[PDB]
Design a protein around this ligand. Structure first.
Ligand SMILES: CCCCCCCCCCCCCC(=O)SCCNC(=O)CCNC(=O)[C@H](O)C(C)(C)COP(=O)(O)OP(=O)(O)OC[C@H]1O[C@@H](n2cnc3c(N)ncnc32)[C@H](O)[C@@H]1OP(=O)(O)O
Ligand SMILES: [Cl-]
Lengths: 392, 7
């Protein structure tokens, strides 16, 4: 079961038995054109792809409470881990409904695999509809997320079946491009982003060995280094409300035009993705002295289970989402984000080096991480881009 | 997201 590559040079040795069959550019192929890798198919396979004996397809109705519980349990026990098997993402059921039932979600795109004899859930992959702006093209695509194979099913070529089947189910709806991200290198990244980490509770992070002490730095020195103001400083910062949905959509739409890979959100999508839900998504807008909203910051909640630590069980992480500035300096906005996450009990504030994040990452005492996020397009050939042009 | 921790 030949394994995944983390760097492009590691990807140079590997051969991709599955991805070589797919409409994606080859690694190292220099891309100077814009368009689909292959034309749209005008007749689509009607029958689901074959699973190995003893396994069967089942679309997961996440509105069924028990079924949503089956999915949370599969991901809680088999989804993305760190390399040293110390942390695994702890997606909550309400978070999964937020991520998997945005506007336009379809039941057949919650594609599960069950054991035939026991009906045990052992596989999953998902699509959600997404209008994507890529350079000079706006196209209706899907975003593929939550590909998961039960640990007992690993390295048996079940993921290619999940990918082909969700591809077929997307093709049936007339969509022929997709966007997705991964921590491994596959043919062929359109952009490579790096995680950065802002310690909020440095003692806990070092205790559970998420971070380490700097060579000659003490715990007492580290805690003083990362100490934050007790309350934000931007005038008029307050949580987003229903009345802010239009202006937040307006701010986000205009702000994203400067990047090359961005989503195109309807106002209903802005409501879904940004309206605050506790322990899921927080959005704060800046309302100035005239009553007009000029900026906003947002971050979502994604805790990680701590595998074996005697006193700590959960690593509470906030992930930077979208941060739009027109009147408040982005450095001030992200400084307030750190304070707001600290007040809310988060242990670490994660962000990528995409969009304009490089302008504040080092200044706000973020430290570079060891993990990258690779961005991909399915069936779309276009030049690669730097992280600062990625807005997805 | 995939997993990362400070280098
Ligand atoms: C138009 C619509 C199109 C829609 C489709 C768009 C494309 C969607 C693409 C999917 C977007 C996913 C976005 C997310 O959800 S990224 C999150 C992925 N999930 C995890 O990392 C959770 C932990 N790991 C697992 O559950 C399994 O190890 C997975 C399921 C990841 C692989 O299972 P397993 O370990 O049992 O391997 P196998 O023997 O079955 O299969 C081996 C083949 O799988 C290729 N592989 C390995 N990892 C990934 C990966 N992360 N993305 C795409 N392909 C991957 C691998 O290179 C090899 O191909 P090749 O090397 O032979 O070529
Ligand atoms: Cl559903």
């Amino acid at each position: 079961g030949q394994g995944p590559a983390k760097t492009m040079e590691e990807a140079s040795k590997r051969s991709y038995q599955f991805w070589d069959t797919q409409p994606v550019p080859k690694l190292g192929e220099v891309v100077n054109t814009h368009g689909p890798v292959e034309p749209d198919k005008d007749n689509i396979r009607q029958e689901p792809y074959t699973l190995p004996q003893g396994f069967t397809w089942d679309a997961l109705d996440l509105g069924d409470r028990g079924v949503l519980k089956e999915l949370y349990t599969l991901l809680n026990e088999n989804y993305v881990e760190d390399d040293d098997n110390m942390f695994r993402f702890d997606y909550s059921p309400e978070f999964l409904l937020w991520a998997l039932r945005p506007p336009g979600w379809l039941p057949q795109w919650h594609c599960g695999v069950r054991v035939v004899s026991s009906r045990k859930l052992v596989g999953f992959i998902s699509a959600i509809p997404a209008n994507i702006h890529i350079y000079d093209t706006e196209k209706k695509m899907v975003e593929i997320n939550f590909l998961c194979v039960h640990k007992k099913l690993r390295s048996k070529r079940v993921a290619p079946v999940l990918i082909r089947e969700i591809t077929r189910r997307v093709h049936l709806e007339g969509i022929f491009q997709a966007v997705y991200t991964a921590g491994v290198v596959l043919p062929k990244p359109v952009g490579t982003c790096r995680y950065w980490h802002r310690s909020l509770n440095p003692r806990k992070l070092i205790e559970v060995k998420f971070s380490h002490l700097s060579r000659n730095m003490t715990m007492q020195r580290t805690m003083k280094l990362y100490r934050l103001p007790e309350t934000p400083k931007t005038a008029g910062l307050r949580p987003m409300e229903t009345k802010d949905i239009p202006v937040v959509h307006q701010l986000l739409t205009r702000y994203l035009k400067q990047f090359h890979l961005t989503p195109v959100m309807s106002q209903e999508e802005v409501e879904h993705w940004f309206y605050p839900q506790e322990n899921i998504i927080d959005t704060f807008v800046v309302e100035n002295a005239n009553g007009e909203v000029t900026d906003f910051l947002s971050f979502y909640t994604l805790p990680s289970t701590i595998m074996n630590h005697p006193t700590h069980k959960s690593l509470k992480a906030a992930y930077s989402f979208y941060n739009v500035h027109t009147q408040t300096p982005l450095l001030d906005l992200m400084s307030d984000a750190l304070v707001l996450a600290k007040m809310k009990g988060f242990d670490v504030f994660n962000a990528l080096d995409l969009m304009e994040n490089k302008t504040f990452l080092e200044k706000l005492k973020f430290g570079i991480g060891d993990g990258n996020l690779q961005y991909y397009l399915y069936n779309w050939k276009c030049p690669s881009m730097g992280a600062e042009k990625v807005g997805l | 997201d995939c997993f990362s921790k400070p280098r």
